[PDB]
Amino acid sequence: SSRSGGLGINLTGADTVIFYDSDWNPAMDKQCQDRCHRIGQTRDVHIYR
DNA sequence: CCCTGGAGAATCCCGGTGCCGAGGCCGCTCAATTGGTCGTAGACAGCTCTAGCACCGCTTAAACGCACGTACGCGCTGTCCCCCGCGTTTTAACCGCCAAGGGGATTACTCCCTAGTC
Ligand SMILES: [Mg+2]
User: Fold this and answer.
1) What kind and span of H or E run contains A27?
2) Å between A17 CA and B70 C1'?
């Protein structure tokens, strides 16, 4: 869920982010899309919307 | 047979800080006092009248003892069934998020209402 899990979370294993739906303001979108590539992402993170 | 040391847990209780509202203070304010009237209704007899206090002697109708007797409230036995304490799950309000009107005030342009003198 874009709210319960959209805030600070340390997922690193996945290298791809999928945005099934958009949520108005882009702040939450950027918070969601940065839950994978934060520090330990050793591979390029691909984001699809 | 039944009593309890220990333990689990609910109670009583006063620190101990934050809050919102009980009470005080301020500014109107309207209704109880008070002058009178004038006439209304109840206190004061008064005549009346009407039901009750006590009395008399009966009359068996109820009231009470005695004896039989007998069955039911209560206390004994047993089982059984069903509701509670606890553990797990799901409705149930409440508070945040967003983009759009509604509108109420709020101020800007302006435009007619107002009023002066060569
Ligand atoms: Mg953080």
Assistant:
1) helix A26-33
2) 97
